[PDB]
Structures are given as structure tokens and as C-alpha cells.
Symmetry: C4
Subunit: 215 residues, 4 copies
């Protein structure tokens, strides 16, 4: 919201430069009429003209700054979307290492781009960069706590890392967010079975079968 | 067309600030020559200078505003296309929940983006969000009444919702718009048969077969 | 190149508004020193101030115009690329009617976008809009006479339209541009055979086989 | 960093135009009070007004220039990403010749776009433009010396060109950068065997098998 604050400061600055020159000019109009002495009258006109000159230059400097501020903001916002989109295209051609870089660039431009973080996570898992993938998913999840897909995907990475207990918890969270996700239920089952949690595993397996009879 | 109206107001404002200063300055040129009294002459010069100072500041404020107005309009238009495109890419990777969000964002930026509405509809159906899908298709159709594809897709959602009568009507409209759409004819047939409208179902089935002998 | 011409006119205008005010101001500096009469001196100062006031307003109006001109040019260029890209994405999801509209939009924004014309052609053929497809390909070809792919694709549309003679010519042109295109050779063969041009058909068939022994 | 240098020159110019007018105006305020002679006082006011007029015009010209500089920079950066993205989409539809052109355009806009160079390389290989592909890969590699994928892809082009020795070296570099790349190891093996380097070929083949038992 800094732009709102800065905009108000810019407007106030322009106003104040003029108001000062206005008030003095109004004073001078009176003073010139009152005291008919060229050497005082002209001195006041020179001062008025000087204040105006400064005012206008400062204003031009403010226009320059605002033009740049606006333009940079747009450049950034456009680029961040372009990098996410680029990563998606690179991923479609299986240019996974390059896709990861594109997502990384979107993140640097906008660190709370949960999508870029999620997608980075996916690419890193596909590239077998499992530890880095888990961290990327963790970030996407903190940004969006109710992203059931991110939770499920985290689950898969954690299982691959041998983190069966944490994997089971991540799958369980995806399920609470969306109980019909038969895949999540089956994968939860697999983790629980592997983990020795046979009764829970059996229930998870059953839910995948029962929830959608055409799975 | 508000921008056209605002542009005209901005131009008129700049013109009027100057015209007032012009007319007065022309008056002052005469008055100075006519009445050779420094205390009156300078008073008029001070006033002229003040009007100019205000004029120029106001103009600078208008330049600032117009710069921002133009820039924001562009940012919005660019972003709305980017969100539709993003949704399409996310859909290609089967990131359907995320694709739906991207289409939603395009809609908020432009509520009459029939494409975003149609596509949202498609994603929602694929995600089994059938009631929401029907509403999204309805919006796309109101925006584009002769979108035969949107009508056919609405038909599919309505049938899935058990709305066989409404589904048959939606398929029929797609067909009137494009009579060669064998798929629409076959799907119409399926609805009509399910609906007990056996004679109409038979005709619809026949048209799908007859319209294109290599279907 | 109109922008170059307009830019020069804008610069010249700004220069001339100032140069006139400069020359007169220099004249006035001399005249004030020479003729010590307040009623003449001030009259000249008022005139100088008025010319400056006009100059600056006109300049501000020019800044406004140039800002808008630049911004609009960019908006158009960005949008035209976005529409081609959109059409390609819609085509990947088989949203062919929508893909055609996106290409059409790119064309309206830039009528010499051979790519958009070519792609439109392709979509129209896929949509069975063969007559329209032939015209779109014709436009892409006039824009790029050495686009062997566009010539081959035109060939396919023309054959589908029953225009076997014109199809054979379009295939032949694609071949002259790229003689190794075994597909073009085979398709030329098919047209020539269908057309009764059996000796030429035989040669075309042989070239497809001989050019690349692993075709 | 030229923009930083130019920005500083623009700011300094605006400052200096004003500072000169300030210093002189301050001098004039004193001189008017000191020497009560209209013909000298007004001469100084005219001069002050002239300096201001010039200053403001020059500033407006600088605003115009900066607006254009900023806008052009953005246009270029946006377009270069769009061309890479366009090439990727064209490649997905197998519009390879067109994809190559899009990558070429991105390169002209930004000659150190390693991604565009790499991708161009890939398209050229797919299009059987092997000599050109090798050069494009060489450029991508010089820009990014630790792009293991670019090294492997260069390897494939070089082998296709009959350059078995250079191909083996390119594959070896990809392997040093990423030792788990079983594909690179197998392809290295194939080159080494073809090249008569049977003992090295055997080791390379073994590594592909041993590195990932599920390859």
C-alpha cells in the first residue's frame, strides 16, 4: 500500500508548492497596489517567479518518478505471470530443468506466488530433487493452507523421502479438505500399510473403493 | 466510453485554464500601455503570473492522472488475457483446480469474458462441480447466445445433473446453430431415449449416422 | 513510419514555441534597457509571459498525446501476440472454433500477421470450413510466398474442395521450396493419380520413397 | 547500466537548469532592492523569465524522452518472453519451422537468451538442420556452460553430423555436470562403441544400467 502513501505524498507536495506560491502572490497583489515603489514591486515579482520556477521543476521531477514507478510495477506483474506460463510450457515439452528455472524466476519476482511454488515443487519431484521439492511444497502450502492438491503432492514427496509418518499426515490433510479424493485415500492407504498401520490402511483402501464405485 | 468523456474533460480543462490566462493577459497588455502606473501594471503582471502558475500545476496533475489511467487500463487488459491463457496451460497439465482459479481471475478482471466463463464451466464439470458448471455455462451463453459448443457442453452438465429435459433443450439449441454436429445429435438422442422420448431419440440417432457416413 | 514523422513534428513544435519566445525575450531585454518607460517595459514582460504560458500548455498537451500514442502502440502489439498464443492454446485443447476467433482477433489487430492467417487456415480446415480455409491460406502465402508449409496445407484444402488441379500446383510449389518434403511428394502423387496424371503421379510417389529410405 | 547513467544525466540537467535560474533570481532580488531603476529591474525580470521558459521546455522534452525510453524497454522485454513462449506453443502443434522463427525473433530481441538459443537448436535438429543446430547449441552452452541438457543435445546433433569424437566429448561434459543421467551415459556408450572405443563404451553402458536399476 506504499504506492497509496507515496501517491498522497506526491499530490500533497504539488499542492503545497502551489499553495505557498498562491498565498504569496495574493499578498503581493495587495502590496503592489498599496506601496507604489518599483524597487519593492519588482522584487516581489522576481520572488514569485522564482517560487513558480522551482515548483514547476519539482513537479516535473515528480511526473518522471511516477511514470517510472507505474511502469516498473507493470513490468514486474506482467513478467511474473509470463514466467509461470513459461514454466508450464517448458514442462509440457518435458524441459523440466528449464521449467524449474522459470518458476524460480516468477518466485523471485513475487515470493508469495503459491502457484509458482507448487509447480516448482512438482518439477523438482519429477527431477528427483525430493528434498528441495518438499520445501517448495511446504512454502506453497503455507501460502495456501487449503490447497488439497499441494498437500497430496507433498505427501508423495515425503513418502519418496522415506518420511512415511509425515507423508501420512500430509495425505490425511488433503483428504479432510476434499474427502472424495479417492487417489488421496488410496495413497494414504499405501503409506499406512507401509508404515505398519494396517487397520487404518484397510479403512483408507476401502474408502477409495467405496467413494466412487467407478474408480 | 467513460475514457472518451474524461479525455474531453481533461482537454477542455487545460484549454480553459489557458484561455482565461490569455484573455486576461491580452487585457493587461492594453491596460499597461494605457495607464502608465507601476503600482497597477505590476499588480496585473503578478495576477497573470499567478494564473499561469496554477494552470501549469493543474496541468501537471492532469498528466499524472492520465498516465495512471492509461497504464492501469493496459495492465488490466493484459492480465485478463494472461489469466485465460494460464488457465488453458494449467488445464493441459491437468491442474484443473488451479485452472479454474485462473479463469475466475480473468472473469473478475472482465465479467463479460465469455471465453473465461465457458472454460470455467468446462473445468468445473471435469472437477465434478456440476451445479457451478451449469451456472458458468449459462453465463457464457447469455454473453454469446450463438455459441453452439457452449450449448452442447451445458447439455452434458445438465444431463449429469439429472436434468434430462433441460439437457435435451440445450442440445437442440446447439443443433439448430450447427445442424452437422453429429456428436450433438447423438447426445441429444441419448438424452431423449433416457427421457422416454423414443421417437425423437430414434430420429436424433439416425441424424448422427446419416449426416456424416464416416462418423 | 508515421510515428517518426509525428515525433519530428512534436519536437519541432516544442522548439518553435520556445524559439519564438526566446527571440522576443532577447529583443525585450535590449528594449527595456534602451527605453526606460514602465508602461512599455511591463507591456513587453506581459507579452513574454503570455507566450510562455501558451508554450507550456501546448507542450503539456503534446506530452499527453505522446504518452497515449506510445501506450496504445504497445497495447496493440502485446495483444496481437497474445491472441496468436491464445489460439494455439485453444487449438491444443481442441477448442477449434474458439481458436479460430482468437486468430481472427490477431488479424484484425495486425492484417499482415501471416502466422495468424496460416493458423486460421488450419483451424478452418479442421472445422471443415474449406472455402474459408483456402482463402486464409492464400492470404498467408501472399504475405510469405516462400512458406512451403502454407503451400502444402493449401494443397490439402484445395484437394478436399475437389480442386485437384490447383491442389497439384500448390503441392508442387511447396516441393520446389523444399524438395525433401516426402509428405508433399506423396500428397502430390495422390492428387496427380486422382487427377489422371499417372506418369507424373508415379514419379512423385517414387520421390517420396527414394528421398528418405526411412519414410 | 546505460539507463542508470542516462537517468543521472537527466536529473542533473533538470537540477542545473533550475539552479542557474535560482542563483540568478536570488541575485536579482538583491539588485532590484538596491538599484531602484525600472529599466534595469525589468531587464533582469525578463532574463529570469526567459531562463525559466527554456528550463521548462527542456524539462518537458526530457519527460518525453524518458517516457519513450521506459516504454520501449518494457515493450522489448515483454516481446522477447512472448516469442519464446510462442515458439514453445508452435513446437507443441509441431509447427517446427514457425517455432524456429519465433525463437529467432526472441534472440534478435535478446542475443543472450540462452533458452531461445537452446530451443532453436532443438527445433533445428528436429527439422534436420543439423549444422545450424550445432551452432545454436554451441551458443546456448557458451551463455550457460553448466547446462547439462544443452551439452547432451549438442552431443546428439554432433553424432548425427558424423562428429563422433566431438559428440563423445559433449556427452562426457553433460555427465560430469550430472553423473546420474543414465540417458547421457547410454548415448555416450553408443558413440564410443561406434567410434571403436570399446572399453570406454562398455563402462558407459554399465553405468547406465547400474546408476538406476529401474532404467
Amino acid at each position: 500500500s506504499k504506492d497509496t502513501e507515496d501517491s498522497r505524498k506526491i499530490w500533497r507536495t504539488i499542492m503545497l508548492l502551489l499553495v505557498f506560491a498562491i498565498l504569496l502572490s495574493a499578498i503581493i497583489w495587495y502590496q503592489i497596489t498599496t506601496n507604489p515603489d518599483t524597487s519593492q514591486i519588482a522584487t516581489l515579482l522576481s520572488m514569485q517567479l522564482l517560487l513558480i520556477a522551482l515548483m514547476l521543476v519539482v513537479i516535473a521531477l515528480l511526473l518522471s518518478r511516477q511514470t517510472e514507478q507505474v511502469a516498473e510495477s507493470i513490468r514486474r506483474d506482467v513478467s511474473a505471470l509470463a514466467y509461470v506460463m513459461l514454466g508450464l510450457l517448458l514442462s509440457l515439452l518435458n524441459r523440466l530443468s528449464l521449467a524449474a528455472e522459470a518458476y524460480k524466476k516468477a518466485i523471485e519476482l513475487d515470493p508469495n506466488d503459491a502457484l509458482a511454488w507448487l509447480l516448482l515443487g512438482s518439477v523438482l519431484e519429477k527431477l528427483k530433487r525430493l528434498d528441495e521439492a518438499a520445501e517448495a511444497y511446504k512454502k506453497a502450502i503455507e501460502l495456501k493452507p487449503n490447497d488439497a492438491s499441494a498437500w497430496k503432492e507433498l505427501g508423495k514427496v515425503l513418502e519418496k523421502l522415506g518420511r512415511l509418518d509425515e507423508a501420512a499426515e500430509a495425505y490425511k490433510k488433503a483428504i479432510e479438505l476434499d474427502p472424495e479424493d479417492a487417489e488421496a485415500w488410496k495413497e494414504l492407504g499405501k503409506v499406512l500399510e507401509k508404515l505398519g498401520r494396517l487397520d487404518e490402511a484397510a479403512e483408507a483402501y476401502k474408502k477409495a473403493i467405496e467413494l466412487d464405485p467407478n474408480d
